[PDB]
Structure formats: C-alpha cells, structure tokens
Amino acid sequence: TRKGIIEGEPTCCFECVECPDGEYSDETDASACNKCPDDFWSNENHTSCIAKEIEFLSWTEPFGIALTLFAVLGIFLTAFVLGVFIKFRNTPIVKATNRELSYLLLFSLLCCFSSSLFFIGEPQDWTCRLRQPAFGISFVLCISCILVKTNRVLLVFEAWGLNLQFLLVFLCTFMQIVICVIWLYTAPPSSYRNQELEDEIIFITCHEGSLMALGFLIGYTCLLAAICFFFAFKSRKLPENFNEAKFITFSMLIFFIVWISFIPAYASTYGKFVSAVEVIAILAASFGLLACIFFNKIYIILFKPSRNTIEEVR
Amino acid sequence: EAKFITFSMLIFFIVWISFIPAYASTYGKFVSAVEVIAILAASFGLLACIF
Amino acid sequence: TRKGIIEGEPTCCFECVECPDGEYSDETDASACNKCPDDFWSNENHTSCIA
C-alpha cells in the first residue's frame, strides 16, 4: 500500500491506497509503488514480486500425457507391423508390396510418430528448428514410398543400378530436404518468450524464421499427397494387393480431411494448446496411412494365412 | 454404403477431436466459431458422403 | 496523471504518476486516480472512461 495526497492536509496526513497489479510496495510508508522487474509479477497482496508462470505444452500435463500415450501407441503399432513384415518377409504378401519400400515406409512412419514428440515440452531453439522439418521430411518420404508403390507412377517415369523406386523417393524427399536446408540456413526458427498475450504468465512459442519456407514445406507435402491421391484414384478399382490403390486413396482423403480441419483448429487455438493441435493432426495422419497400408495385410498375414499366396494377392 | 458411412463418421471424429485444443483454450466469438465450424464440417461431410 | 508524494518535501512539490489501467484522472492537479464504474474501462490516455 502506498501514500496518497489528502488535499489541503499537510504531507504527514496521507491516505493509504493499494498498489495496482504488477506493482508492489515491500516496505511500510511508501510514497510510490515499484513495478516488478522483467519476468516478474506482483503477488496476491502486492507485498512482493513472484516469477511469472512459464506456460507451454508440458510433458506431465494430462493433455500432454494423452498425446504422449497416443504417440507411443503409434510407434508400438508401427514396430509391430515391421515385426510381422520381418518374420513373414518370405511370404507372398510381403514380397508383393515391395519389402524394401515397406521397410522404408515403416521407418518414415516411426519418424512421423516420433516427430509429434518434438511439439510437447518447453520449446528450445533446436526443438523449434526441428519441429516442422522433421515431420515434413518424414511425411514426404511416406508419400514418396506410397506414391511410387501405386500404379502408373513408376511406369510413366521409366518411359543407376538401384531400383527407380528409390530414385523417385530420393528425388521427392530431396526437394523437401533442400527446402529445409535453405530455411534453417537463411531464417531458422527460434524459441520466443512471448510476454505480450498475457501479463502474469510467459508463453514459450516457436517463432518460425520464414513463413514462406514453412508454406513451401506444406505446399510440397500437399502437392505430393494430391499426386498420390490422383494416381491411386485413377487405379482405385484395381484389385491388386488386396485393393492397394483403394486404401491409398482412403489414406490420402484421411490426410486431407485432417489438415483441412487443422486449418480452423490452428487458427482458433490460443496459448500453449496451439502446439497441442499440431500433434493431434500429425498423429491422425500417420495413423491413417498406417492403417490404410498395413492393418488389412497384417490380418491376412497373422490370421487366416490361406490368402498369403501369390494367387490370392494377385 | 460402408465406405461412405466410415468416411462420414471419420470426418465427424476428426473434426471434433481437432477442435478440442480450441474449445479448451479459447473464449469469445472464437469458441462459438469453433462450434459452428465443427457442426458445419460434420453436417457437410455426412451429407456429401451419404448422398 | 495523479499527484505522487515526494518524501521530506511539502505538499506543493509533487511528482506526476500516470494513472493505471481501469482507473482515470479527468481533472488537473488530481490527488487520486478514480476507477471507472462497472461495465466501464479507461481509454488509452486515462482521461475518461469508455464502455
């Protein structure tokens, strides 16, 4: 509490008035209040200054707990599918869906699920620099593996030594990696201590250096997804590999629905939970692809292996 | 109509789960905007997929 | 801007302390910042109160 002038009365006759928020008076008979220093805010009685609460998506927060559980479950499912594909690597079903491409796709799916874990926790500089590029590269690799696994994609390109499948996935991912290198070399993101949205707490955000580069990452990812969707849709009715193109189409629609929904969800989320939505979108898309590429096959491989033959896989 | 039912309900679940961090972190006009956008997305997805 | 007390110096010698948000001072040589009424906040200059 500080002194206030009682009009007419001398200096020794003063009123007592409480300090405003953000200012404090530690000692008694104070003529003015003291603003709390940077990163500090007044306490509940304006008696002293206490540190502002540092807000971010926490690992121990129940929302973060659920998101970590879902990412762990996704990694577990991807490793399970990889294990099934490895033990049954000599079966016709695993041979048909190119085993090397399936292994690389599962590696990229593990990377996709793990990349969501770079959005939980207190944002550091390197974490913010790796968030967007990690998911971008991993998902471009996924869409490249799928996009060269379908019909009328490798044929049109082929019309050295290693398969053209790997050359195509390398080029498609290399464009993304070049974009990311240009980004983190010219305008890398950083960890920003935002003290403007709220006055009693400090948000920790990832300030992306160039929104042009982030837009380029997203545009390239969506362009590859659209190419994959179109080429699978032109061949969706084909029954090869247990209707592989139909499920590729399903996965691409799941991806597009997830990100079109990500638009308003991100544009309407404030505070720490913004990182939240990112994780969910990531997870969902990954899960989609995973299911649409493997669960069916996994069934036919583990249970009722009668169709695990060259004739049935067709 | 199996895939159409599946995709309609996938749109419903995906949209409503996507807006959970918005419903738990926003107030004012924007929370009602979240409500309207989620409802419209669900209804449009169901109508499109089924019809 | 209200009048703040200089310790050890008489009443005629005061400092100019800006009114905080929510309160305001409309007159000159004011010794107290007055809070805006209910459903009313203070404008940028703290010279009046707007709804």
Ligand SMILES: CC(C)CCC[C@@H](C)[C@H]1CC[C@H]2[C@@H]3CC=C4C[C@@H](OC(=O)CCC(=O)O)CC[C@]4(C)[C@H]3CC[C@]12C
């Ligand atoms: C975030 C998590 C909860 C999503 C991961 C998906 C899983 C819940 C799995 C378990 C049940 C799976 C489904 C179980 C059954 C089918 C039927 C199957 O339909 C067929 O055309 C095959 C016909 C046959 O089985 O002979 C296609 C795969 C699908 C949709 C599977 C897709 C992936 C699903 C939904």
Ligand SMILES: COc1cccc([C@@H](C)NCCCc2ccccc2Cl)c1
């Ligand atoms: C859609 O495919 C993708 C390709 C790369 C990254 C991503 C995800 C992981 N980040 C969304 C980026 C969202 C965003 C937009 C503007 C400013 C900040 C932010 Cl954070 C998706």
Ligand SMILES: COc1cccc([C@@H](C)NCCCc2ccccc2Cl)c1
């Ligand atoms: C989700 O299905 C519903 C069933 C009944 C009502 C409603 C709407 C009209 N109000 C609650 C919306 C709150 C909410 C709940 C879960 C996920 C996101 C959100 Cl934003 C939705």
Ligand SMILES: [Ca+2]
């Ligand atoms: Ca007097």
Ligand SMILES: [Ca+2]
């Ligand atoms: Ca004196």
